[PDB]
Amino acid sequence: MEYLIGIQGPDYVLVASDRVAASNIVQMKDDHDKMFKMSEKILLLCVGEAGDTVQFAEYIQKNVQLYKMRNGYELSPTAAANFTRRNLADCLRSRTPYHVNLLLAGYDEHEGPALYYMDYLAALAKAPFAAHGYGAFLTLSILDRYYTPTISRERAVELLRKCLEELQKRFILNLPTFSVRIIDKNGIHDLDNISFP
């Protein structure tokens, strides 16, 4: 029911998510932020069953920031991905499985940009582009169609706009506004919200 999309590039990773939090039918919030900055150059996008999303996101955020404070350097995106995957996978067997679907986006000085994908069963996969939610089924073909490994960031925001206006055209739920931000060597950069009135 909630849409996440991520596009990796040569020197960046672009991420966007819908801004809707909802009750049964009422759309309680129009400006919900599903993006959590674990560190300066890594973001965690989370969608899933309510409560589990915020609880797990906050737990991983605070653990990563504790790593920062203790050791003086930030975790790698790959290491953060493996860590949150471990936490999610351990809970899967337990009586309190966090039903959460995540997308982790990061930039490493040594290893460059990275986008990571994990499902509620806690599989992990690096990917060039990925999406979560029912809208992902509609929008993945857009990315698979027009994506290039050498895509520039202007082209990437254009591609993302195409992907989202497809949701506007066809997806049953109303996802009127989306948040967008880029990670690069400089760090997380907020971008203007792609808003379809």
Binding site: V26, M28, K29, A50, G51, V54, Q55
Partner: protein, 200 residues
Amino acid sequence: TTTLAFKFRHGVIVAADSRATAGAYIASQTVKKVIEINPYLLGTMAGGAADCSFWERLLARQCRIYELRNKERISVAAASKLLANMVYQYKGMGLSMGTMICGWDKRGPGLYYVDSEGNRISGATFSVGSGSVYAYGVMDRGYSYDLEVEQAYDLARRAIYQATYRDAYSGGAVNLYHVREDGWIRVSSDNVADLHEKYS
């Protein structure tokens, strides 16, 4: 039930009905569904009355302990997060709560919505209960951040009135509160019959 809360320039207006039902039997038409957690922040109860009352009271004692220990009143965000964590610990065990923690802090007016499912969200307008869907239309069409205090009271009263008109399990009287920067005040308790006399 129907509970209503919105933020505007001069504070937060909290409104609620007073009907509690078991099955279709109206056990009480005078339930006080706006729980005065503290002199400075207050909450609402929708869903299970026992769950809401017990957990909001526990939040109240935690808030007073915090005030005594840290020499400062807890923020609405911290109170909401405490309650959210407490209810989330019991997720899947059948608690039913939907409640709006309301207060001022250093940030400004504070309105949050927390539910037994686990969501905690802050927003300009909220409504919780069976009559939420009916209250939302009137509140949304009438709401503006720049609103006179009397006009805010009026839209709150009318929203709860229409919600009681349409929804069977919400009724009784409309209890209304204004959260003001010094603290909360209880502005009115108008019965739905008198409100029907007025509006019609």
